[PDB]
Amino acid sequence: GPVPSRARVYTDVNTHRPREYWDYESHVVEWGNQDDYQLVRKLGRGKYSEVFEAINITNNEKVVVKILKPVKKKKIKREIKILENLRGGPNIITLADIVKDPVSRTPALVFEHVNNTDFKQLYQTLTDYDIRFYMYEILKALDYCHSMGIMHRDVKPHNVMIDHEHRKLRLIDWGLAEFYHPGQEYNVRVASRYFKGPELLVDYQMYDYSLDMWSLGCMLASMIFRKEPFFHGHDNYDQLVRIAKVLGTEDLYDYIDKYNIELDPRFNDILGRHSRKRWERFVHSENQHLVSPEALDFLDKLLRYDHQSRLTAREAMEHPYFYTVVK
């Protein structure tokens, strides 16, 4: 069997809470009044949701309404409970209300509104300083949710709303998030392919908050190198091949050995042998204004195979890459 692992930070938060904090299946929802809201304009569609700008007609407040398609109530309560436990944290999207149609019983979550920039416009315009600023703002949200015993598990550009005109950022889409219980084996079929950590790709189930830090590093590399996504796999096996062609195979097999991880023999066959490629090799004329020695050192400390060796979000906030933002 694989060697067990525990988070280096916030390991025991959930045992320092009443059971109902994390036992989301017992949660009793506080339902508001759907008649308080009217739709204004559609913003987007999810696999299980339709997302609208809306207005509270009792007090003129602009909000966003996320109408939920039929999924298991268990998943809905998990997302509600997590949003209520994290409400108020820095750059965490704020849940304002929870309503349901009395006839069709379709539920909806009501949130503060964000005027999100086209991520195409967004990439053209961000400077080096901007990337550092927004990265620090994401770290504030991740440190906060990790400190409250939750892993997001789906960190990626589509789930980071940036209103660049208002220099405003929110981490959204808490539908994959989960409570961290040390020793628990989690489903590895989470995150989007390009942002999946090596632990997911080798089926190492005793992962923790540090999964989100791998995803964050994938976002940082795509932004500073102007290559989206940075690790562009065709499937979950190719995804680890793409990672191994940058980080190298030597460290991958050291990680597998350290945790007594068993790979499919054919997976081992396709991984081959790849030298580590220095981060400087990804710098080009078109992206060099976003790259600095500090950025590459920071990236190198996020994108590590061994989840225990990655910076925590709190450690990341201390990195010299952020000195120009905070001091």
Binding site: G46, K47, Y48, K72, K75, R153, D154, D173, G175, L176, E178, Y186, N187, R189, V190, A191, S192, R193
Partner: peptide
Amino acid sequence: XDDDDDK
């Protein structure tokens, strides 16, 4: 959304 839930 490449994935959906936890188990």
